[PDB]
Amino acid sequence: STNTTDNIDYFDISDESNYYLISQLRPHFSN
Amino acid sequence: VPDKTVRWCAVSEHEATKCQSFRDHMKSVIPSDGPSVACVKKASYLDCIRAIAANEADAVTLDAGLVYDAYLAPNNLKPVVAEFYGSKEDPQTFYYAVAVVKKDSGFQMNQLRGKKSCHTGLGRSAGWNIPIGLLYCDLPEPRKPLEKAVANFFSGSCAPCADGTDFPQLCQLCPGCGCSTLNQYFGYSGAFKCLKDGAGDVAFVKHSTIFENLANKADRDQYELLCLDNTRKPVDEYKDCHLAQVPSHTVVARSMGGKEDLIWELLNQAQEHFGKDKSKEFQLFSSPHGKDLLFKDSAHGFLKVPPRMDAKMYLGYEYVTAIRNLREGTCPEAPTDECKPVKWCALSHHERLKCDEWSVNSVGKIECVSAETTEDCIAKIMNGEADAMSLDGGFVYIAGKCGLVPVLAENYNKSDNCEDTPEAGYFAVAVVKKSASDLTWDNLKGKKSCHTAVGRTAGWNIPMGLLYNKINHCRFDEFFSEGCAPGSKKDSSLCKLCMGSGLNLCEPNNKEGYYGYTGAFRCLVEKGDVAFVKHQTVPQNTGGKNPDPWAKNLNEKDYELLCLDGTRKPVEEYANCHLARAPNHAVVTRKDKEACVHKILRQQQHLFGSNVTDCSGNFCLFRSETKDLLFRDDTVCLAKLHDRNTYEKYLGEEYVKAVGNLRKCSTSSLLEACTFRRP
Amino acid sequence: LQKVKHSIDQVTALSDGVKPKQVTKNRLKEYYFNIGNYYSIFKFGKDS
Ligand SMILES: *[C@@H]1O[C@H](CO)[C@@H](O[C@@H]2O[C@H](CO)[C@@H](O)[C@H](O)[C@H]2NC(C)=O)[C@H](O)[C@H]1NC(C)=O
Ligand SMILES: *[C@@H]1O[C@H](CO)[C@@H](O)[C@H](O)[C@H]1NC(C)=O
Ligand SMILES: [Fe+3]
Ligand SMILES: [Fe+3]
């Protein structure tokens, strides 16, 4: 049945200031 | 709750107005996730200090002399952000306290009695504590309470924040003493206004005040300052006749709740945009309606206070002793015949037993106060709870930076005349085994290392300096696979090989089994590949001299100590294989207790020293149970130091340079805290 | 989920509210910038 993972775009990182969060989803910013 | 706004104190409506402007213009450049300012209004500084203590405010800026009123119980505040006053090329943390008077008034410092005086506030540094403390012991008894006898010494004065109901003479020039900018005589500009209006004859300010208020050179040409040795002097050469130096104004905060990182974030991002004329629109260090609001006008930037430095270390020992003896009112006599007993410092319960036994075997001249790590005990010598201790040169360097001098040294070679003869110092070696004959000083990478402790000479400085020349990395957990270096951070592998448990792992004291010289030798015997110890470690531990089980089976022959070129040479001749000369351990103390520690220790070592045989059944100061308690076990006598009592004099040039090549790499917080003092 | 719940609580918390009709121009600027930031957190939080 299910043996693999197709989606990875939940992985992310923010800045060192933790002010801006990047997503791998579109459009990567709330701004 | 946004939970990142920083509430703040304002004293009056002018400072509240500058607080609101500061809020509006600091809203712009910071993101909305970042910190923000909230303005809380109080009536004086004291209501603000109680407000921060009762969690209604978070920060305020005040003098050093009010930091002494701030860190007392139940307030328990702490300085967190200092500030510098010079140009950005040379930051100056201190500033100068001066006494500014009208021209040709015709009195020196001795003829000061009964003149009208203008003080900048009750308890502030350059206005109250330095001017009163200079002329303090000339007042007639009773000195207590202070401001009563000061109120009799002066014929009318203005000191803000003093009690006008209980004392009228302090509030004689000023109509009613008020702790605000709303008082026209409060502050640096207020005291100089008290001089300019002619209501006062002398005003006490800092050096920059007359340059701030006056812009015409003739107005600088009239007013004068009086000196310590009773001369007049013009104000432009203020470096010659300053009364005393003082630390900066400081932002205070709570001790536990803080919060430090958010104040430093906010004031840092305010500093880069608004402080030194970066924007013409808003100014951080000036305002049109009032001056000296929220900060000084003479400040030019902020500096972070390191996390080890509290208030009592921030003010120094001399200034805390001055404010305490001034507030209580003792005016000391100091006969040099008698001496109070010495408060020796010990650590971690294996030093305390032998210290207390020495306190009873001595008649009473030695008393014991203890700590848990040696960095706490150096600070405990600095504050005043302790007097002297014995350190190796790696910590005699640090305590030499903090302001301590070495008095006596330890000799490690027997002679008929050892007390007068200076010793050249012991050697630092690395020890490997015969079973691992493939080892070379050229290749130590990925091999297991054993150290004495972080910061010591033969264990840390001499090896990692040479390895710092070879690797060019500051970190040493990458070059070595594992090892045991006590005092390191818990996250490194250098604590992953050590042995003590539980929660006593890598604690730099005798609770760790691998601490010291002999403990590092147990690191080499049990789990290590190389050890870094002194050159005499193997003859003491091997040969069946230790009654411990691990050391009786060890032979002196099969160990071997490697040179720096790559040659493999045995233990009996250390003079072939030595990394560098290390200086001896020394006894350090403060400057004022130099003579008494000298006399008590020489008088004390003649009774309990090295000539005492039959050690069990009696007392020995130097002979210990193989753990080097309070001294190193091979110490024959304590050599007298004359003409060489300074860390750079005693330690010699090559070792000081060798630590100076490791200057950017050391991670001890106490060195950082003692190096913030230097401008 | 924490960001979504906080943004909903902030916007509804402003809709509780004192409801001022009159603001200053900079107050209008941080006003619109503020609530636009909150709704931005809501949209990004939804897709996440
Ligand atoms: C360690 O001390 C011993 C004895 O104190 C030193 O031996 C010296 O040997 C010379 C031989 O000519 C004598 O004249 C000296 O009187 C001895 N004593 C001193 C204090 O020099 C030995 O040289 C010392 N070794 C080290 C490395 O310090
Ligand atoms: C050795 O110690 C004993 C102990 O009382 C003392 O009498 C003697 O003077 C000491 N000798 C020297 C040379 O210091
Ligand atoms: Fe000041
Ligand atoms: Fe040492």
Swiss-Prot record, chain B:
It comes from Homo sapiens (Human). Changing H300R: In allele TF*CHI. Has a bilobed structure, each lobe binds a single Fe(3+) ion. Does not always bind 2 Fe(3+) ions. (Microbial infection) Binds to Neisseria transferrin-binding proteins A and B via its C-terminal lobe only. The L3 helix finger of TbpA inserts into the C-terminal lobe of TF, altering its conformation and probably disturbing the coordination of iron 2. Electron microscopy suggests that in the TbpA-TbpB-TF complex, TF is captured directly above the loop domain of TbpA in a chamber of about 1000 Angstroms(3) formed by the 3 proteins, where interactions between the proteins serve to abstract iron 2 from TF. Binding to TbpB does not alter the conformation of the C-terminal lobe. Transferrins are iron binding transport proteins which can bind two Fe(3+) ions in association with the binding of an anion, usually bicarbonate. It is responsible for the transport of iron from sites of absorption and heme degradation to those of storage and utilization. Serum transferrin may also have a further role in stimulating cell proliferation. Keywords: Disease variant, Disulfide bond, Glycoprotein, Ion transport, Iron, Iron transport, Metal-binding, Methylation, Phosphoprotein, Repeat, Secreted, Signal, Transport. It is linked to Atransferrinemia: A rare autosomal recessive disorder characterized by abnormal synthesis of transferrin leading to iron overload and microcytic hypochromic anemia. It is found in: Secreted. GO terms for cellular component: apical plasma membrane; basal part of cell; basal plasma membrane; blood microparticle; cell surface; clathrin-coated endocytic vesicle membrane; clathrin-coated pit; cytoplasmic vesicle. Hydrogencarbonate 2 binds at T452, R456, A458, G459. This is Serotransferrin. It comes from the Eukaryota.
